Amino acid sequence: PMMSVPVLNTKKALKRVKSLKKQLTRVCLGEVLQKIDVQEQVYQLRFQFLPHAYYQQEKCLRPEDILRFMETRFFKLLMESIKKKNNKASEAMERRVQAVREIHPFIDDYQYDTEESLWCQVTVKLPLMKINFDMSSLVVSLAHGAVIYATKGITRCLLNETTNNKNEKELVLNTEGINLPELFKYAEVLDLRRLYSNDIHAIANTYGIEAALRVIEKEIKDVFAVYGIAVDPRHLSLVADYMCFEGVYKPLNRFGI
Amino acid sequence: QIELEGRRPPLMASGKSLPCFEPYEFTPRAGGFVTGRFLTGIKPPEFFFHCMAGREGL
Amino acid sequence: ANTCSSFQSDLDFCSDCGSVLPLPGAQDTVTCIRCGFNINVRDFEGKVVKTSVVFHQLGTGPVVDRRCPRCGHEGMAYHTRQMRSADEGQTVFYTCTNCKFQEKEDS
Amino acid sequence: DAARFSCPPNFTAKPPASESPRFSLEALTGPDTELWLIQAPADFAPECFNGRHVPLSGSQIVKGKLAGKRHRYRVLSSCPQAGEATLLAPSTEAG
Amino acid sequence: LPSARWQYCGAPDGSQRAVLVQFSNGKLQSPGNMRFTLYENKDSTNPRKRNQRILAAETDRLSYVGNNFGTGALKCNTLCRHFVGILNKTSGQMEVYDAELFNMQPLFSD
Amino acid sequence: VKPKADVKRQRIIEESTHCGPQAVRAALNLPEAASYDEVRGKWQDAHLGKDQRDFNM
Amino acid sequence: SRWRNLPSGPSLKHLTDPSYGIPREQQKAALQELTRAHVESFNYAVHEGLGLAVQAIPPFEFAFKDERISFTILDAVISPPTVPKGTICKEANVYPAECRGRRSTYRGKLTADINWAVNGISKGIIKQFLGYVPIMVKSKLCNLRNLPPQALIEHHEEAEEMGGYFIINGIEKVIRMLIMPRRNFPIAMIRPKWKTRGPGYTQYGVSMHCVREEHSAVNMNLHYLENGTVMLNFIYRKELFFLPLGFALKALVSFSDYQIFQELIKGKEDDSFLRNSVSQMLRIVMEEGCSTQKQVLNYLGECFRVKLNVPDWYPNEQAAEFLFNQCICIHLKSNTEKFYMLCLMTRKLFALAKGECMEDNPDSLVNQEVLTPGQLFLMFLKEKLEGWLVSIKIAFDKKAQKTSVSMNTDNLMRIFTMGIDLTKPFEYLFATGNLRSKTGLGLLQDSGLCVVADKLNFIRYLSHFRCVHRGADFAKMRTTTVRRLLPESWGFLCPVHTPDGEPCGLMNHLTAVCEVVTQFVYTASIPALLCNLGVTPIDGAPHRSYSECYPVLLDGVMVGWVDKDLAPGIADSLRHFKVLREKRIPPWMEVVLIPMTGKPSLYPGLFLFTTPCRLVRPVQNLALGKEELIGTMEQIFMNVAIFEDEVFAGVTTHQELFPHSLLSVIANFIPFSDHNQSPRNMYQCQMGKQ
RNA sequence: UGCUGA
DNA sequence: AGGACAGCGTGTCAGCAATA
DNA sequence: GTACTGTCCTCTGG
């Protein structure tokens, strides 16, 4: 899936877009990590996060937000997965630690890193009888699908500088995901008329069916264009009018009959 | 330049593309760059890559 | 015996899970030693420094392009693929420079 | 009760050798004595090394003569690895 | 590099053999409390049986048995040969003897 | 093909037999030079990798 | 050699020679070496392999009345074709010239001598006539063997024929070399459809294809489960059975859990997920009830007794041995060797799972071998002999269960009552091509096994004895990756000679210099030589750390752990022996040494194959100039120049015999194939056969 | 079911 | 109501042998 | 082969 919104051609918009591109790319716990150190029924875990030199440049992240993420989402999804396994097996440092263990009954105390996330570990223990194995497997299969924050549906943006020779000045913010409403907030940075997507079900849900007809036609035309073939527009018009006849984008297949 | 799947000919499991070539050989010849022509025929290794391509076509 | 701890060091087999009382309770030759060993096992481990890292990773396609026009002029670029049978000839894939318009001839 | 090994009827216990004072525990525990384990191919003839200087460290090729034919044997010497075969010796202390 | 002069004093008739033991479950923490008994086959007329031997080790808790015949006899006793070298550090002379290796294992009967 | 035109073709084919190291190296973003065996190892790693998108590069 | 006296430029003064029509004294010898793999395989299958096949053949004991009867087959013998009974006259022999005139099968008589006993003190040796088995043409059980071209013309034969085929109803079926995975070698595979085999299975596993003396094949898969545990899948009679490892390891060896564990952690004695997962395999399912070898054999016996169809009076411990003998590691006689082989295949799944090793492509010829006409023939013969025993004693048990004392009067009238079987079953596999077997013979294909050999031309005919079919099932596949012409089939398969439609990439042909191995040797003094060379036996004292050591294998049997700084010299010494024909190293042993680095390269170790179905090809061994033979897997770790002046000092270990060695026999008949485009030259190969 | 032709 | 999953699907074009 | 429909399957809402 993809998108392509032109950039509005104003000096302020060009400056804001850099931040916009850096704002919609997904940053995942796994993309920001050096290596874990698991000790094992008392299972400790130190994350040892990366320095900002080589990941803050194009990800727009800060260490307090990243660490706060572990306290509220990763360190409880960890107990969620531990239960997933164990159900079928047979002055200020203080408030943060306290609220965090207010909510869970297993953790004991983590750490603090007053100097750029120096050493940030945690400790757990299930004292009676649990399957003591290399649980690093779980806390590694989980530290990959754990994403700090991302716009739903968008996996990465990119500004393909030039798209025109006639009015070469055009800039395009292409994307490799699809979320139409999460771009409506930038009607001053980007041109939301001229927004395009190859989805045809998302266009049909944000703009209607008469707007999905033309996306269908343009998609078929651009599919044939990569080979030099050129079907006459009068044929794609009829195909798109038949497909979208009864208000919905209906497939041309066994369930359409 | 021979291209099979949009990529150069595949390597073996040991890192050589053909029994004649050292493993992980940098020369473009080892990756399917045929500098021979049908006027003066192509050597055996180039013959091999050309056959790979002509067969994937079918 | 002067050996690994998960088994019945002096005797034959492997012990059972070290849970409760002495060993606890093996099947053959139950002979019991060290209700609990001294040090809980220290397993020092680490993870990969290639994939997850953005540290320690700081340091260590136009074709041959012959001349034919479609929209403008002055030099396309071609990839040859034999997308045909053994009784036919090789198809050619051209691409422009000023723009990016792909051709896909038959020969 | 330990089921005590029971010797099959066709076997008899071999007495110690009181005519063996060489492999005696006393002889082997002498301050000037070192024990070495040697592993060789099944067809190895140890006499082919008689008088020759076998290495006590590293790797060396040693030449031997067997039945008129020259053989060369690569000899590897190492530090005992935990779990190696233990030599048994007769002991007066053990009855 | 340190070297030793090799001598095979060995066995007078080759009837004489030393005895090496290896335990399948690791190292014995206290080999000093073990009593080893070597058993030989009474049949000295059958060349096949005359070299059959059993080594038994008894502890307070368990018994170990090794044999040079049958499944318990392992390949290393033949494909390779084992020797024991006795090195005199003072003379630099190594006396070499034939050795027999026994793989020891635990004793239980139904 | 004319002679005196196949000589240029032959010299260009001779020149083309020296363009592998630079190509691969400058695609692995390796130190610009001084590595002649780190490049083979990096190529091998990229080849036995799981993702296999640093190999297509 | 065997490629000398190859003409340097063609001549035309052989036609127009005063001796053009005079039949020659001996046959051509270059045409003979084309069907040589089809004939030398059958020669073993019918004389030396048949005795071994019948030797396995467990004695078929069963219950009659209140009696237990044992029937064993002491020998089976196939006789050359001959006039049926003596009812005919003037010539006992029967030459293939007829059965082409008439439309009949060239079939020889298969007869065995069974030996039936009642408790082992009452016995009599009867000689039953099993049936008729088809015969190849110049196969040592045929009447045209040892005939010069002049005597081959008075019988109506081609004077230049190399048979290598069967005449089933006068149609000359040409059973062709199918491709099998490999034999007696563990191939580590990453197949994602494996996790559907159970609740916690992963997409990792080492498969092994085991063949014993060319009469039996079996496929066993060791699967990795997410817990760190390994399972074993075996197939008996087309049913898949899953046994946790540990049940298998404890049964095979009367060893403690400590030496066993110490074996599966040999090279990774610092890893702790492994050390913990090995203990879970030994304790979780085996300290749960069975801790002595017999109790494990007893438990395994009770669960599997129903589907192994064992005798009712068999102890459960005896039914377990039946499973291990007939389903896991057929190739190895010992149970101690079967343990060490299951342990190296596991040590390998742990390395594939931890990404320390590269999956072996099953579609590279490195990990492939061929199925010859003799392997299919014996593997069907043995199965049909077992079926004959079973049927005769079905009839036995079913007739009367009556006082066998006087029933020793009709014992032969009983055995003959079911000896009426073995003939028609055999002709179906040859006349139709498809296989009807209780066990598919460890094959994976049940059709297209034999095909019609048509003499439209002599270039259509000669290409039936050099064809190699990847498989008949791959003709139905969305993905096209078994049709890729990888660079590992250099010198073993022709790039150009492939059908150019639906069979493309699936039906290949051998190059002119390539050849199938078919000889069988002793290979008993090899394990004792490897130890002289520097190997240390599996038993112990490696002299290093089990991680700086190479695991040595020789035909499924792990000799064990040549040191890491002695592996190169050992491989070079072994290669010099095979080249100069010293020791007893077969001229065709493949000494492979897959080096080990820190990279995820193919699993390290020194293999040494000498089995009878691998492809080999000649290459001029430089530094000796002695015409070595290299194999598909041994060719990936060596440089082989083509033209001289391409040979260098350190590089170019070997050199190829002729520059056109890469091309097939037919592709060598196309003139100037170098100046035509490749889809054309491949087309020439399909048009020269029509 | 093995082949073959566009 | 978040799923888990079992369940249908198609697949250019004509000949010959031969045999169910 | 993958992706669809389908099919419940039964988990928190009045």
Swiss-Prot record, chain B:
It is found in: Nucleus, Nucleolus; Chromosome. Belongs to the RNA polymerase beta' chain family. The clamps form the DNA-binding cleft. The bridging helix crosses the cleft near the catalytic site and is thought to promote polymerase translocation by acting as a ratchet that moves the DNA-RNA hybrid through the active site. Catalytic core component of RNA polymerase I (Pol I), a DNA-dependent RNA polymerase which synthesizes ribosomal RNA precursors using the four ribonucleoside triphosphates as substrates. Transcribes 47S pre-rRNAs from multicopy rRNA gene clusters, giving rise to 5.8S, 18S and 28S ribosomal RNAs. Pol I-mediated transcription cycle proceeds through transcription initiation, transcription elongation and transcription termination stages. It is linked to Acrofacial dysostosis, Cincinnati type: A form of acrofacial dysostosis, a group of disorders characterized by malformations of the craniofacial skeleton and, in some patients, the limbs. AFDCIN patients may also have structural cardiac defects and neurologic abnormalities including developmental delay, hypotonia, motor delay and seizures. AFDCIN inheritance is autosomal dominant. This is DNA-directed RNA polymerase I subunit RPA1. It comes from Homo sapiens (Human).
UniProtKB/Swiss-Prot annotation, chain C:
A motif (Hairpin) lies at residues 87-88. It is found in: Nucleus, Nucleolus. GO terms for biological process: nucleobase-containing compound metabolic process; termination of RNA polymerase I transcription. Zn(2+) 1 binds at residues 14, 17, 32, 35. The keyword Transcription applies. Signal peptide: none annotated. Its main location: nucleus. A zinc finger (C4-type) spans 14-35. GO terms for molecular function: DNA-directed RNA polymerase activity; nucleic acid binding; zinc ion binding. A zinc finger (TFIIS-type) spans 64-104. SUPFAM superfamilies: Zinc beta-ribbon. Keywords: DNA-directed RNA polymerase, Metal-binding, Nucleus, Transcription, Zinc, Zinc-finger. CDD domains: Zn-ribbon_RPA12. The TFIIS-type zinc-binding beta-ribbon domain contains an acidic hairpin motif (residues Asp-87, Glu-88) that likely coordinates the nucleophilic water and magnesium to cleave the scissile phosphodiester bond and release the mis-incorporated 5'-ribonucleotides. Belongs to the archaeal RpoM/eukaryotic RPA12/RPB9/RPC11 RNA polymerase family. This is DNA-directed RNA polymerase I subunit RPA12. It comes from Homo sapiens (Human). The lineage of its organism: Eukaryota, Metazoa, Chordata, Craniata, Vertebrata. The gene is POLR1H.
UniProtKB/Swiss-Prot annotation, chain E:
It comes from Homo sapiens (Human). Keywords: Acetylation, DNA-directed RNA polymerase, Nucleus, Phosphoprotein, Transcription. Coiled coil: none annotated. Belongs to the eukaryotic RPA49/POLR1E RNA polymerase subunit family. This is DNA-directed RNA polymerase I subunit RPA49. One of its GO terms (cellular component) is nucleolus. One of its GO terms (molecular function) is RNA polymerase I general transcription initiation factor binding. The keyword Phosphoprotein applies. Component of RNA polymerase I (Pol I), a DNA-dependent RNA polymerase which synthesizes ribosomal RNA precursors using the four ribonucleoside triphosphates as substrates. Appears to be involved in the formation of the initiation complex at the promoter by mediating the interaction between Pol I and UBTF/UBF. Signal peptide: none annotated.
From Swiss-Prot, chain F:
Belongs to the RNA polymerase beta' chain family. This is DNA-directed RNA polymerase I subunit RPA1. The chain holds residues 804 to 860 of 1720 of the full protein. It is found in: Nucleus, Nucleolus; Chromosome. It is linked to Acrofacial dysostosis, Cincinnati type: A form of acrofacial dysostosis, a group of disorders characterized by malformations of the craniofacial skeleton and, in some patients, the limbs. AFDCIN patients may also have structural cardiac defects and neurologic abnormalities including developmental delay, hypotonia, motor delay and seizures. AFDCIN inheritance is autosomal dominant. Catalytic core component of RNA polymerase I (Pol I), a DNA-dependent RNA polymerase which synthesizes ribosomal RNA precursors using the four ribonucleoside triphosphates as substrates. Transcribes 47S pre-rRNAs from multicopy rRNA gene clusters, giving rise to 5.8S, 18S and 28S ribosomal RNAs. Pol I-mediated transcription cycle proceeds through transcription initiation, transcription elongation and transcription termination stages. Residues 2-57 are annotated as: Funnel. It comes from Homo sapiens (Human). The clamps form the DNA-binding cleft. The bridging helix crosses the cleft near the catalytic site and is thought to promote polymerase translocation by acting as a ratchet that moves the DNA-RNA hybrid through the active site. Signal peptide: none annotated.
